[PDB]
Symmetry: C5
Subunit: 220 residues, 5 copies
């Protein structure tokens, strides 16, 4: 541990009729942008995800992590400004979180990202934090134990206070989507469900190897 890492799930919705039918130059420009980000060494793009078919207001997602938040701001603004892909898309939702130095987030461990991801914000009940620490730790122990049968699903739980309307950001990565569905269904059977205020919206996506795969399927 002992590392500071802001994380961002930037969710974009494609504007129909704006991308056009000739997309080779757009693909090349977006790929050059991401290669420049990678060679700069400040912002690490953990993944690019196709959100088609998940919900009506989202089309794709970029999950990237940087040591400072201003670097994420610069990368996000540059993506929206200097690339055609960012110019023909609307920002639908932004999930920001900060990891500060037991169990650590999967992206902190450096694990290989899974094929499928689900991402959602999380807000606990008002009395959750002032609850007796004995009871809170027991509830959290049961909640964690409920995920013992899913070693293939990696979980990221990162604090998100003051970086949005939420308190935590949760991200599940799995080779198969049905494993994520089963994990959520089984986690419904826990006492921690009694201390939940907000858990929406959900964003479920498939990791693409390169930006060309994403661009070639966007509408318009």
């Amino acid at each position: 541990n002992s590392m500071q890492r802001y994380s961002q799930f930037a969710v974009f919705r494609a504007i129909p009729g704006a991308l056009g039918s000739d997309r080779a130059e757009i693909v090349a420009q977006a790929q050059s942008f991401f290669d420049g980000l990678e060679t700069a060494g400040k912002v690490e793009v953990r993944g690019i995800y196709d959100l088609a078919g998940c919900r009506a207001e989202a089309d794709f997602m970029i999950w990237w992590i940087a040591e400072e938040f201003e670097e994420i701001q610069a990368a996000f603004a540059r993506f929206r400004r200097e690339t055609v892909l960012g110019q023909v898309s609307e920002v639908a939702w932004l999930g920001n979180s900060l990891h500060r130095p037991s169990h650590l987030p999967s992206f902190i461990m450096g694990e290989i990202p899974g094929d499928w991801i689900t991402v959602y914000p999380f807000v606990r009940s008002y009395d959750w934090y002032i609850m007796d620490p004995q009871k809170r730790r027991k509830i959290l122990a049961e909640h964690g134990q409920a995920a013992r049968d899913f070693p293939d699903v990696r979980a990221n739980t990162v604090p998100a206070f003051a970086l949005g309307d939420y308190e935590w950001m949760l991200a599940f990565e799995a080779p198969r989507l049905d494993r994520i569905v089963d994990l959520m269904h089984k986690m419904r059977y826990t006492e921690a469900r009694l201390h939940v205020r907000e858990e929406t919206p959900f964003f479920t996506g498939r990791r693409v190897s390169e930006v060309s795969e994403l661009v070639n399927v966007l509408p318009g």
Copy 2:
């Protein structure tokens, strides 16, 4: 059973002034797209439904089922990309569910789809799943018995965790719409109503024989 099937209710809203008045080529292209989907053998389009007059933000719906979710993603993106019908429509709502290996969904049995359908998402109360299994099973038995007076209405209840903001997807198919209305009204008289958080939005539609019947009624 012993087969995995993802299901999707893709709801689209027609943009006024975009379809135009000459629709023969649009009809032919949409029919060719659906015939190609059928001949590919991966995605099975269970139905196409006209949602006109049900609610303000919906115009039609496609109910299709595939073994893998990426196939549904590909079909959905292709519909929005390579057909004029998908290019002049906005995605209003997406209801995703996964059926995994009692009483099984109607589309799992392969029953003939009914003339009328009603589709809605469903979210249970926070304490529903950690409730005493005896009490939950008794409540579910009463809820099921309340629907034994409507043998002509087929019910699909499919888990929807992590595939959206919801927990279950419910679909009722009947030859007559008044049967669905009566079933919902009678199902209001059950104890399970005490454990409901979200059940909206509703989408009520009539099954069309072919895409031409749907296209010829959409607003110009």
Copy 3:
């Protein structure tokens, strides 16, 4: 009784700058459409109401009743498709209900529609239907007694399950609007108010004699 009738309150909002200033041909076309509906004998247009000044997102309303819901769907689609008035308007809200075979809705009796109408959907509490039938009957008797001092206000309470997000559709018709306001205010003084979940949005309008009166006041 012994008659099945679906009812629809189709609420439309006028798009500014689309109707124009020359409206004689639009008036003639809309009148021809409504005369064709009347002469077809399937859909009965009970009223056309001007909603200007009631709320921000509504401009007028068509209240029509038909034996089958397919006929209402067809008439609604035809209005939105083959008339300039329907082409330059957006659907803001749709209230659907079904009357099936005590006290009957005013439109079932065939009473002359009042000059002023108010319309809203209604959703009861979760425990309303499983409440002890004696207590529910007493509450409903008190609620009905509260409306005995307003014989000039006719009330239509029609089930709306599965035809939208609601449970009941309520419509009050009166020669004067202050009578409706007083009736609602006095009905606030009832125990049934303890079993209400949703009762919005409201749509208050004045019945117009012919579509020309409505068209000549819509924003250009």
Copy 4:
């Protein structure tokens, strides 16, 4: 008082880029419209209020009162139809109320309107009206007594049942805005706060002497 008066707070939001930079003719036309309203003698425009800086979706407000509601409808439609100012604005919110024949609204007395106004709708709790009349009258007496230290703030509480989604319309007029802020803060210290369901949105504005002052500040 033996007078019937409907009151309306019509809130409009200016469309950027539609008003233009040359506004003398627009000012003259709007002033002519309001002079015609005053001459006709049916609708009394109590005030015109600049709402800039109060909230994102509002730009100005017209507060007008008429004996019949159809007169208000005609004036509102005419403003949106036959004036450039009404043609380049969107209706953001409409607050309607009816005053029917103790303490009466300020506009019934005909008091000089204050420089600053705040306006909001109000919805009481479900059990407020069936509460024991002694307890309700005691609560209302305390609530009224809490406003003894603000004689310079005039309050208008008018029933709003069936004329929208609300129950009451509340308007506070003061020479200074800080007096309104202090009054609201002091009214927070009352038992009536335990019986409140809805009190938003708020509209705070400054009374303008003539429509030219309002038009000259709207965004181009």
Copy 5:
């Protein structure tokens, strides 16, 4: 102190495709506008903040304070009217507050603004103000003690009654964003959390030295 100061957090969202690529003249015009505001001596612009990456519907924010609210209205309208930057932006959210003459807001003391800010509205529970003053003051003392471990984060709590939909405006200024995140997380561990109704939306931003730095990063 005896200083009466209205404060405003004007949040703007940039319209894509409206700013263009040549921004030198826009920068010069905006800088001239802000220099004129500073010279006039009525409205003091406390800060300009880049909000990119915080949320989907916000792009930047202006925090300015003036003795009278009409001066803030004039400055806001003038910014939206006479500058290209204000003409190519939409108002997303407005947070207004009034400070009337223990512990004072940071902007009242004149402290140097921090590099990072987090701004949100706040609404207490209905029974918060009529709670026993002993208990309320004890809860507030504990809440204040919870923030004594963060001397580097300056807090501004200003009443916001009748100037919007909220009750208080809260702003946290820090040299580092992680300090704000930690302060919010630690403040979750207080009894005052039991008396919260609304605390969203949040606006987290980085203070820019000049308007050129802000304009050069906005999407084209």
